[PDB]
Amino acid sequence: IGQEMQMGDYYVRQLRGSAPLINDPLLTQYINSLGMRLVSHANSVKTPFHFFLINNDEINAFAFFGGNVVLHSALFRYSDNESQLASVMAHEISHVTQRHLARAMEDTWVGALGSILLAMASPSFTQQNEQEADRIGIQVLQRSGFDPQAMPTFLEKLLDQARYSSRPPEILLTHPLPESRLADARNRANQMRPMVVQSSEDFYLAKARTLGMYNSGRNQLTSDLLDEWAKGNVRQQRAAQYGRALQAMEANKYDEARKTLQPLLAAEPGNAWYLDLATDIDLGQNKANEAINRLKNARDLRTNPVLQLNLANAYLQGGQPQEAANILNRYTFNNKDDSNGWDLLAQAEAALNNRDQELAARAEGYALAGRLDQAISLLSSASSQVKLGSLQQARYDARIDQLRQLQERF
Amino acid sequence: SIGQEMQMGDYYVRQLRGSAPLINDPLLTQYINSLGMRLVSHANSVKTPFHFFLINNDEINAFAFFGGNVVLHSALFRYSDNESQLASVMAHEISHVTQRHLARAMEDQTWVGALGSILLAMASPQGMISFTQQNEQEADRIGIQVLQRSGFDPQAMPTFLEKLLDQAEILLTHESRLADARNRANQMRPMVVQSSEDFYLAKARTLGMYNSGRNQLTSDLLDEWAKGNVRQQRAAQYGRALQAMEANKYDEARKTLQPLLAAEPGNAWYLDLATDIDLGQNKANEAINRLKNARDLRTNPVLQLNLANAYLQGGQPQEAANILNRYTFNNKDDSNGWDLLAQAEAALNNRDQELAARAEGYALAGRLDQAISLLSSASSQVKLGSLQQARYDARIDQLRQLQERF
Amino acid sequence: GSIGQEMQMGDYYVRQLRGSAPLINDPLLTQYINSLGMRLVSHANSVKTPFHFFLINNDEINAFAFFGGNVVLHSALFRYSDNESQLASVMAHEISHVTQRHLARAMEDQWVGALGSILLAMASPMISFTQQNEQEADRIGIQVLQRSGFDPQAMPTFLEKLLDQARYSSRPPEILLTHPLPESRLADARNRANQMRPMVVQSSEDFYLAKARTLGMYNSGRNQLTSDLLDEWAKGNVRQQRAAQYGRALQAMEANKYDEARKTLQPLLAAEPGNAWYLDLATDIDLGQNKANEAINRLKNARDLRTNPVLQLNLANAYLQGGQPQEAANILNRYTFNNKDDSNGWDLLAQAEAALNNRDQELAARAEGYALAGRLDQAISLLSSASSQVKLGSLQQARYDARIDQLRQLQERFK
Ligand SMILES: [Zn+2]
Ligand SMILES: [Zn+2]
Ligand SMILES: [Zn+2]
C-alpha cells in the first residue's frame, strides 16, 4: 500500500496534464462527497479515496492504486437516478478494495500501463473479477442507503444500447457484461429488501451542470430533458429551473438568468449551487460588489470550498487582489491538491506584482499536472529573485527539494 | 455633581460600544490605557477615573467627554512618528477633561441624546462639536506641561500641528493658535526622546492588523524601521509576521516570529501572535503549553484571554471557564471576557450561566432591554429561591435602574 | 588514478554535505581549523591527497572522514577540548584513518548513494571501524600529533575523558559509535603516550579565540559559551584572558547591545590593531550601528589585507554595507577565482552584482554557490537565465554556456 499511494499520485498527476478533467468545485465536491459516502460503508479500505470526472461523452469508469476512481461525465447522461450512478462507483470502489488490478500485474512497465489508463480517459477485467465487483458492490450500495435494484436496471440499460446502437459503449470493454453477469446481478438485488429512495437534490443539480456547462458531443442538456424534468418530482423541477438559468447564463443572457434563478435563490438563499450561479451572473455584468456582498452573507462561507473560491474570484474581478490572496493563501494550505486555488492565487499575486510569489503559485499548478521539471524551473526563478538566506529562498529551495524526490522516484 | 457626569459618561460609553467601531484588542487597549494612566497621574486637577478608547477610523480625530472618557482614532498612529507625538494628542485631550471644558460649554444651554448622536457621528466613519479659540488655547498650553512631567517631547506637539496645516476630521473640532504652540514649546526645554518598545509594536499592530483605508502598514515604513534602532527593527519583524498571519501565510508567520520569541520568550506581544499562529494551524495543545509556562500568566490580562481562548479551541471548556469566571470579575467592563465566558458556558451546557454572560455583553453595548430579557430567561431556568435566581433578578434590578435614569 | 577516482567521490560527498548539513562557513573558524589541520598533515606519513577540514554546527560530539582527505568535525569538539592538543589529537586520529585508507579498504573489499546518505545522517542533527582500525589510527595519530609539537598525553586524556562521559550519561557520545572505545583501546593509548617524554605545550592564542567564537557566535543546544567558562578564563594564562574579553564582546554584539561591545572591545583593539580576529569583530560592531566608513578605513589601513582572506571578505562586505558595490565587486571577482570553494565569496559577489544591476553576473555568481552545494540542476538553471540576457556570440554567452557544459559533465559522472 505504501508504493501504490505513491503510484496513484504519479498517475493522477499525468491525468491532470493530459486528460480533460472537469475541475468544477460544485461537481468535484459532489462526486467526492457521494463517493466518500460509499467508501465509509466499504470493507477492507486501505487508502484514501478520490473520484475524478473527465469531460468525455463516452461512457466508462475505471480505477487504480490509491483509491483513485475515474468517472466519465457521460455517466450522468445514462444515470436516471442517483442510485445508478453510485452503483457504478461501488462497482469501482470494490475493484480497489479487492485489489483486482493489483493482482493482475503481480502474476518499462509503469509507463506502458499509464498510457493505457490515460488513453481511456481522453476522448479489461475477466468476468471472475467483474462478478466479484458486483458481489461486494451492492452490499456497499445497500448499506449506503441506495436502491439495490439500480444496478440490474443500469446494467440492463447498457445492454439495451449495445444492440440498438452500432458498436457498444466503452464501459463494456473494461467491464464486460455477458448475460450470466446480468442474471447474477438481477438475482442478488432480488434477494435483498425493496428500498424506496428519492435521488438527492444534488444529483439532479449535478447532472444539469454536467450536461449544461460541460457540454460536448452527446453530452447535451436538451429541451426534451428539461421539459421532462418540469413534469417530474419537486427535486427535478428545481434542477430544470436551474438548468434553464444555467444555460441563459451560458448564452450571455444575464438578465433572464437572474429572473429564472430568482425563485430558487429566494427559496434557498444559502444553497451553494444557486449562490455559485448568482455569482457568475453578477460577475458577467461587472457587478462584483453585489457578488461579494451576497457571498459574505452566506452562512457557510468560511466552511465551504465552493464559496471560498467563488468569493476569491469575485474579489479578483472586483479589484481587491489582496482580499483574494488572504482567502487563497489559506485555501491552498488546506486544499493543497486543488489546482483551482493555486491558479487563482497566481492571478492574485500577479495583480499585486509579487513576482516571486506569483511564480511559486504557478509552480504548484504545474506540479499538480505532472510537469515537475517545469515546476522546478519556476521555483528556481523565484528563488533567484530573493536574497539568499531569506525565508523565501529557503522556502522555494525546499519545495524544489521535495519535487526532485518525486522525480527521482520515477 | 461628579456623580451624574460619571453616570452620564458611562451612558455615552455604552452607546459608543454598541454603534461605533471600537478596537477591542487586548494588547492595544492595554497599551492605550497604560500610557494614558501614568500620563493621568501627572495632572493633579482630575476628579474622575480615566479610560481611553481606540476607534477603527482612518480619518484623524480625537475627543473626550464626561467621566474622563477619551476617544482616540486609529488614524492617530500613522500621524504619530514617535511616542511623544501620540501622547501629545492624549495630553491635549485629557487636559480638556481635567479642567472640565466640555461640561462648562453645555451648561450654557432631548439634549443629552442630541450630544450622544453627535459623539457617534464624530466617532463613526459613516453635525459636529467645535471649540473656541481660547478653549483649546487653554488645552494645548495646559497640556504641554502635562506631557513634560511624564517625560516626553514638548516639541512633539508643534511638529504635529504643522503636519496638519499643509493638507488644507480633527480640524473641524480642533495660525494664531498654532504659532502659539510653537511659541510655547520652544520656551520650556529640549528633551531626550525615546519611544517605548511597546509604542513601536502597538503602531505595528494597529496599522497592520486593523488596516482600513489610509490606515495601512506600508512597505515603505517597515523597510525604514529595519534601518532604525533595535526597537524599530524588532517591531518591523513583528509587523511582517503580523501581516503574514493576516494573509494566512501561517508557516512564514511562524518563521518570522521565531527569532523574536527566542530572544524574548516572555514578551506578551509575541506570545499573543504565537497563539494566533498555533490556533490557525489547529495546534491548540502547543499554544496552551506555551502559555502555561509564561511568567506573567496569572497577572497579565492579555495572556489570560489568550490561554482561555486556546482552551476553548483545544476542547477544554471547563479550564477556559475557570480562567474566565475569575477574569470577568476582575475586568467587569471587558466585553472580550464576557463573550469568551459565554462561549465556554455554552460548551459546558450551563445554559443559565451562558445567558447571564451574554447579558453582560449586551449591557456593556448599551442594549439594556435585551440584557434584561436574557437574564429573565436565565432566571426562568433556575429554581425559585436559589441563589442564582436572586442574582439574576438583582442584576435585572440594577439594569432597570440604569435605563430609568435616561 | 585511484587517487583520482577517490578525489572525484570526495568532491561529490563534500557537495552533498554543503547542501544538507549545517556547516559553519565562518572565515576565521574555517581558516583556523584548516591551518591547524594542515599542520598535522605536514607531519603525517604517506599523504597522497590535499586535505580539507569541515566544521558542522552540531552540539553532538563526532568526527569522521571520507575519500579525498576530507575531515569533518562537529563544533562540539570545542566544548570537549580543554586545550589545542586535545582537539589536535582527534584530527590526527581522522587524518590517520585517511592515510591508512581504512574506509577505502572496507568498500573495496565488499552503494555510493548508500554511503553518502550515511555521511549526511552523521553530520545532520552508520559507519563503524573495527578495533584494529582504531588501534592503527591512535598510534599513527599520536606520532603525527607530537611531531606537530602537541602534548601526546592529550590523546589518552581525551579518550578517557570520552569514556567517563559515556559510562554515566544516558546515551553515549555519538563519536564513540563511529570510533568504539573499549578499555583495551584506552590502555593501549596510555601506553604509547607514556612511552614518550612529557611535553607541556601552551595552546595557541588562536585556539582560545576559536573556541570563544565557536561557542559564543555559533551557540546551539549544549554548545554555549557560559558565564562560568569566561569568569574561569579571566583568571588564566596570558593567552586565555584576552580570549575572555573577545567572547564577552561577541555576545554583547549578539544581543544587539553594540555600545556595550564597543567598550569591551576597546583595549584589545587598541593593543592588537594588526590581527584579524578583533579586526573582524571590529567590523561587525561598526556596521551594526551604520558606521560603515571607518570600518572601511580601518580595513583599508590593515597590513595583511592583501594576504589574509578574512580581511578581504570583511572589507568587501563593508564596501557593500557602505554603499560602494563596485569596490566589493573588484575584490570579490579576484577572491572567487583564488578561493573557488569558498561559498562566502560567491554569495558576496552575487550581492554586489545585484547592487550594480548586473543581472547575468549576479545569476552566475549565485550559480557557483549552488554548484558548491551539489544542486547542479539549479546552478544550470541560473546560468541558462544568465546566458539568455547576453547576446549570442558574446564573450559572456560562450562563458555561461561552457560553464553549463562543465556542470553537465560533472553531473553525469555520478548520474
Ligand atoms: Zn468491473
Ligand atoms: Zn482640542
Ligand atoms: Zn576512529
Short mmCIF file of all heavy atoms in Angstrom, two decimals, chain A residues 380 383-388 393 397 400-401 404, chain C residues 347 359 362-363 366 370 375 377-378 381-382 385:
data_model
loop_
_atom_site.label_atom_id
_atom_site.label_comp_id
_atom_site.label_asym_id
_atom_site.label_seq_id
_atom_site.Cartn_x
_atom_site.Cartn_y
_atom_site.Cartn_z
N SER A 380 12.86 27.82 -9.29
CA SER A 380 14.25 28.26 -9.41
C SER A 380 14.32 29.74 -9.78
O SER A 380 15.18 30.47 -9.27
CB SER A 380 15.00 27.42 -10.44
OG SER A 380 15.22 26.11 -9.95
N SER A 383 13.37 31.61 -6.63
CA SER A 383 14.49 31.59 -5.68
C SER A 383 15.60 32.55 -6.10
O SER A 383 16.32 33.07 -5.25
CB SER A 383 15.03 30.18 -5.55
OG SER A 383 16.24 30.16 -4.81
N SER A 384 15.75 32.79 -7.41
CA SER A 384 16.81 33.65 -7.93
C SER A 384 16.46 35.13 -7.84
O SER A 384 17.29 35.96 -8.23
CB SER A 384 17.11 33.30 -9.38
OG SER A 384 16.17 33.91 -10.26
N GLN A 385 15.26 35.47 -7.38
CA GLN A 385 14.82 36.85 -7.26
C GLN A 385 14.76 37.32 -5.81
O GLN A 385 14.32 38.45 -5.56
CB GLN A 385 13.45 37.04 -7.91
CG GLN A 385 13.42 36.72 -9.39
CD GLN A 385 12.07 37.01 -10.01
OE1 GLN A 385 11.20 37.60 -9.37
NE2 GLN A 385 11.89 36.60 -11.26
N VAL A 386 15.17 36.49 -4.87
CA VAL A 386 15.11 36.80 -3.44
C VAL A 386 16.49 36.57 -2.85
O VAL A 386 17.25 35.71 -3.31
CB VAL A 386 14.04 35.95 -2.73
CG1 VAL A 386 12.67 36.19 -3.35
CG2 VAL A 386 14.38 34.46 -2.79
N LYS A 387 16.83 37.36 -1.82
CA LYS A 387 18.15 37.28 -1.22
C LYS A 387 18.41 35.89 -0.67
O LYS A 387 17.49 35.22 -0.17
CB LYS A 387 18.29 38.31 -0.09
CG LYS A 387 18.02 39.74 -0.49
CD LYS A 387 18.37 40.68 0.65
CE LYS A 387 18.49 42.13 0.18
NZ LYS A 387 19.13 43.00 1.21
N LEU A 388 19.65 35.43 -0.76
CA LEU A 388 19.98 34.14 -0.17
C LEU A 388 19.98 34.27 1.35
O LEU A 388 20.45 35.27 1.90
CB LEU A 388 21.34 33.63 -0.67
CG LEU A 388 21.74 32.30 -0.03
CD1 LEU A 388 21.19 31.11 -0.82
CD2 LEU A 388 23.25 32.18 0.13
N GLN A 393 13.89 32.28 -0.02
CA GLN A 393 14.85 31.40 -0.67
C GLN A 393 14.76 29.99 -0.09
O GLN A 393 14.59 29.01 -0.82
CB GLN A 393 16.26 31.96 -0.52
CG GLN A 393 17.36 31.00 -0.96
CD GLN A 393 17.98 30.24 0.20
OE1 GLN A 393 18.41 30.83 1.18
NE2 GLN A 393 18.01 28.91 0.09
N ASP A 397 13.56 26.86 -2.26
CA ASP A 397 14.55 25.81 -2.46
C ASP A 397 14.13 24.50 -1.80
O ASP A 397 14.39 23.42 -2.34
CB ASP A 397 15.91 26.26 -1.94
CG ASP A 397 16.60 27.24 -2.88
OD1 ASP A 397 16.01 27.56 -3.94
OD2 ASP A 397 17.73 27.71 -2.57
N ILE A 400 11.65 22.90 -4.07
CA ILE A 400 12.39 22.26 -5.16
C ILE A 400 12.93 20.90 -4.72
O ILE A 400 12.90 19.93 -5.48
CB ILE A 400 13.53 23.16 -5.68
CG1 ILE A 400 12.99 24.43 -6.33
CG2 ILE A 400 14.38 22.43 -6.69
CD1 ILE A 400 14.09 25.38 -6.79
N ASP A 401 13.44 20.82 -3.48
CA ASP A 401 13.93 19.55 -2.97
C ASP A 401 12.84 18.48 -2.98
O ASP A 401 13.10 17.33 -3.36
CB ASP A 401 14.49 19.73 -1.55
CG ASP A 401 15.78 20.53 -1.51
OD1 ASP A 401 16.41 20.70 -2.57
OD2 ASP A 401 16.16 20.97 -0.41
N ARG A 404 11.98 17.22 -6.48
CA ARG A 404 13.03 16.38 -7.04
C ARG A 404 12.95 14.96 -6.50
O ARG A 404 13.35 14.01 -7.19
CB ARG A 404 14.40 16.99 -6.75
CG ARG A 404 14.78 18.13 -7.68
CD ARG A 404 15.55 17.63 -8.90
NE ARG A 404 15.37 18.48 -10.08
CZ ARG A 404 16.01 19.63 -10.29
NH1 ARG A 404 16.88 20.09 -9.40
NH2 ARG A 404 15.78 20.32 -11.40
N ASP C 347 28.60 34.28 -2.59
CA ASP C 347 27.40 34.96 -2.12
C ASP C 347 27.60 36.46 -2.11
O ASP C 347 26.73 37.22 -2.56
CB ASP C 347 27.00 34.44 -0.74
CG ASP C 347 25.67 35.01 -0.26
OD1 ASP C 347 24.88 35.50 -1.10
OD2 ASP C 347 25.41 34.97 0.97
N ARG C 359 22.65 41.76 -13.89
CA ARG C 359 21.82 40.62 -13.52
C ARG C 359 22.46 39.29 -13.90
O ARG C 359 22.41 38.33 -13.12
CB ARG C 359 20.43 40.75 -14.15
CG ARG C 359 19.51 39.56 -13.90
CD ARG C 359 19.19 39.36 -12.43
NE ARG C 359 18.16 38.33 -12.23
CZ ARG C 359 17.94 37.69 -11.08
NH1 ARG C 359 18.66 37.97 -10.01
NH2 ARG C 359 16.99 36.77 -11.01
N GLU C 362 25.19 38.48 -11.54
CA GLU C 362 24.60 38.04 -10.29
C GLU C 362 24.15 36.59 -10.38
O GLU C 362 24.55 35.75 -9.57
CB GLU C 362 23.44 38.94 -9.90
CG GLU C 362 22.84 38.63 -8.53
CD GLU C 362 21.36 38.98 -8.44
OE1 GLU C 362 20.85 39.68 -9.34
OE2 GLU C 362 20.71 38.56 -7.46
N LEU C 363 23.34 36.27 -11.40
CA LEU C 363 22.90 34.89 -11.60
C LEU C 363 24.08 33.93 -11.70
O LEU C 363 24.03 32.81 -11.19
CB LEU C 363 22.01 34.80 -12.84
CG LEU C 363 20.63 35.45 -12.73
CD1 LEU C 363 20.05 35.77 -14.10
CD2 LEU C 363 19.67 34.57 -11.96
N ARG C 366 25.54 33.45 -8.19
CA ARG C 366 24.62 32.57 -7.47
C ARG C 366 24.79 31.11 -7.89
O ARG C 366 24.66 30.20 -7.06
CB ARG C 366 23.17 32.99 -7.73
CG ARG C 366 22.64 34.14 -6.89
CD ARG C 366 21.19 34.38 -7.28
NE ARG C 366 20.55 35.43 -6.51
CZ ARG C 366 19.68 35.21 -5.53
NH1 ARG C 366 19.37 33.97 -5.18
NH2 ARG C 366 19.14 36.23 -4.88
N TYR C 370 25.36 27.47 -5.85
CA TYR C 370 24.50 26.30 -5.94
C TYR C 370 25.27 25.07 -6.41
O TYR C 370 24.95 23.95 -5.99
CB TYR C 370 23.31 26.58 -6.87
CG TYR C 370 22.20 27.32 -6.16
CD1 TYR C 370 22.17 28.71 -6.15
CD2 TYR C 370 21.22 26.64 -5.47
CE1 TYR C 370 21.17 29.39 -5.48
CE2 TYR C 370 20.21 27.31 -4.80
CZ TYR C 370 20.20 28.69 -4.81
OH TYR C 370 19.20 29.36 -4.14
N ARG C 375 23.71 21.27 -5.96
CA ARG C 375 22.46 21.50 -6.68
C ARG C 375 22.77 21.88 -8.13
O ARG C 375 22.59 23.02 -8.56
CB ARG C 375 21.62 22.56 -5.97
CG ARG C 375 21.39 22.25 -4.49
CD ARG C 375 20.75 23.42 -3.76
NE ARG C 375 19.36 23.62 -4.17
CZ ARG C 375 18.32 23.06 -3.55
NH1 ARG C 375 18.52 22.28 -2.50
NH2 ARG C 375 17.09 23.29 -3.99
N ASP C 377 21.52 20.89 -11.14
CA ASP C 377 20.40 21.29 -11.99
C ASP C 377 20.00 22.73 -11.73
O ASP C 377 19.69 23.48 -12.66
CB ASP C 377 19.21 20.36 -11.76
CG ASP C 377 19.37 19.03 -12.45
OD1 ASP C 377 19.77 19.01 -13.63
OD2 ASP C 377 19.10 17.99 -11.80
N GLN C 378 20.02 23.14 -10.46
CA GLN C 378 19.64 24.51 -10.13
C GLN C 378 20.70 25.50 -10.61
O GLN C 378 20.37 26.57 -11.14
CB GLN C 378 19.42 24.64 -8.63
CG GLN C 378 18.90 26.00 -8.20
CD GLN C 378 17.88 25.91 -7.08
OE1 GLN C 378 17.40 24.82 -6.75
NE2 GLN C 378 17.56 27.05 -6.48
N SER C 381 20.22 26.01 -14.16
CA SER C 381 19.07 26.87 -14.40
C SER C 381 19.46 28.35 -14.35
O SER C 381 19.04 29.14 -15.20
CB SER C 381 17.97 26.57 -13.39
OG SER C 381 17.04 27.64 -13.30
N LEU C 382 20.26 28.73 -13.35
CA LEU C 382 20.65 30.13 -13.23
C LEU C 382 21.55 30.56 -14.38
O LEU C 382 21.39 31.66 -14.93
CB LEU C 382 21.35 30.37 -11.89
CG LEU C 382 20.56 29.98 -10.63
CD1 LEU C 382 21.33 30.31 -9.38
CD2 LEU C 382 19.21 30.67 -10.63
N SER C 385 19.52 31.28 -17.51
CA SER C 385 18.99 32.64 -17.44
C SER C 385 20.06 33.66 -17.79
O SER C 385 19.84 34.55 -18.62
CB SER C 385 18.44 32.93 -16.04
OG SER C 385 17.11 32.47 -15.91
#
